[PDB]
Amino acid sequence: NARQVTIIGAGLAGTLVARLLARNGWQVNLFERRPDPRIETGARGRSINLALAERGAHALRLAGLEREVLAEAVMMRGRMVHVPGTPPNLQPYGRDDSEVIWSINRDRLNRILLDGAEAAGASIHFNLGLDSVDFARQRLTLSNVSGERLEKRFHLLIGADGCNSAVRQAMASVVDLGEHLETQPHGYKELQITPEASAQFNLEPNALHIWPHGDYMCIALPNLDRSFTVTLFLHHQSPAAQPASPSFAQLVDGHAARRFFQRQFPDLSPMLDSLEQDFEHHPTGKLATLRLTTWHVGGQAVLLGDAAHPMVPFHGQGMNCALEDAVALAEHLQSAADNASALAAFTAQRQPDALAIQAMALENYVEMSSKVASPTYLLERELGQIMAQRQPTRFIPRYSMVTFSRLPYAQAMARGQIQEQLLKFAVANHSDLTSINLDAVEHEVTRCLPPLSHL
Ligand SMILES: Cc1cc2nc3c(=O)[nH]c(=O)nc-3n(C[C@H](O)[C@H](O)[C@H](O)COP(=O)(O)OP(=O)(O)OC[C@H]3O[C@@H](n4cnc5c(N)ncnc54)[C@H](O)[C@@H]3O)c2cc1C
Ligand SMILES: O=C(O)CCn1c(=O)oc2cc(Cl)c(Cl)cc21
């Protein structure tokens, strides 16, 4: 009875935790709304590609699924900023090619995980959606496509059913989750760059391409077949304040959109063949930041990944964080004296990191779109670089702590704040680098940042 678990959502987090527990003797039963994606090709995912960073890779590593995943992965050395008039600038993400990110297919990743879970001994049941949960009677309801319902008893319930969690609705009715929604004004549209067009325009095959435009932007991620998947991040509607400013409301036709592209991303528009067809057929996606005070009901049920912390995609960490979570949950469930202790402990350890990543993902928007290279900002950053060379065990860029390290998200954010505070005060009333005493600044770095180890 002790090693029974019912997981809702055969997505990314759900399938990893299904594999991690099943392989350790657990009686895992996974329920998926969708039909089996490695047989039937159903609905469009929230995105085609994903940026696989250390946290995610490492989780897949423990699962012994990392190699299979990286088999069809496209390396991403740094970001390729495209600003008209200025030649494309490549800013590397890290030191060498050891510090990279990977462009992997969502469905491929999902399918690899599904195989992994089923291999470990998990029972995956597709075409079954969670309709409701009776926590008091320790039962739940599922439904097939036809409407026919199915009532199953449960011992422990894991809500790994994504953004619009049926498990979260279920919990919210019997307990105050302490939800706090924060609506993202941007929407998104996925558009394609053919393998022929990517070759013709000699686009860097191993980089994360970005077209910044302040309140709106575009990104491109590489595909194994040399093609690219462009995403447009643009407001849903223009404000009453500025009603002439672009939005998805203004682009009523694929032609209106082709005009906006030739007008605002002119170097991009010719690479985008089928812009009109892709704009009309592929729908406008929604974004949000949902924060809950509570992720669990006693030892009975818990939310993991997107189900517990929906976030904006601007740091490309959502799935990384969701895989990191699955590890933590599996470890707590295996170590704790009982499920109430496990869920209490899991939530208590992940909730603060979940918040910091949500915060940092919002902050990253600005960083890649609204950047604004201020004279004092460029100065701060140069002093920051010196401080990183002089103090590698203390001064680490937040992107590096987030993306390449496995330091808890909240610690990465905390350190970042100490660093940004040092830089601001050090530059203060200085025009250039020659004015500041580097040795004095370095002493402060040692006084405010305790060292970090890879051991
Ligand atoms: C455009 C975009 C790009 C992104 N890019 C990145 C990136 O580069 N890197 C990154 O780390 N993150 C990225 N993210 C975030 C990432 O998509 C998510 O964080 C991640 O998919 C969450 O995984 P999950 O397992 O919790 O849920 P999901 O992967 O969303 O899986 C949930 C599963 O639950 C199922 N389900 C739902 N309701 C029910 C129900 N009632 N009953 C049964 N099954 C149900 C669904 O069918 C699905 O299989 C991106 C997000 C967006 C919006
Ligand atoms: O700061 C940067 O250069 C980009 C951040 N980023 C990432 O690493 O993977 C991502 C994936 C997506 Cl979908 C987005 Cl919007 C940003 C990122």
Curated annotation (Swiss-Prot):
UniProt effect for mutating Y93 to A/F: Abolishes kynurenine 3-monooxygenase activity
Transmembrane segments: none
SUPFAM superfamilies the UniProt entry points to: FAD/NAD(P)-binding domain
Top-level lineage group: Bacteria
Effect of mutating Y399A: Abolishes kynurenine 3-monooxygenase activity
Keywords of this entry: FAD, Flavoprotein, Monooxygenase, NADP, Oxidoreductase, Pyridine nucleotide biosynthesis
Function: Catalyzes the hydroxylation of L-kynurenine (L-Kyn) to form 3-hydroxy-L-kynurenine (L-3OHKyn). Probably required for the synthesis of quinolinic acid and the siderophore quinolobactin.
Family statement: Belongs to the aromatic-ring hydroxylase family. KMO subfamily.
Protein name: Kynurenine 3-monooxygenase
Native organism: Pseudomonas fluorescens
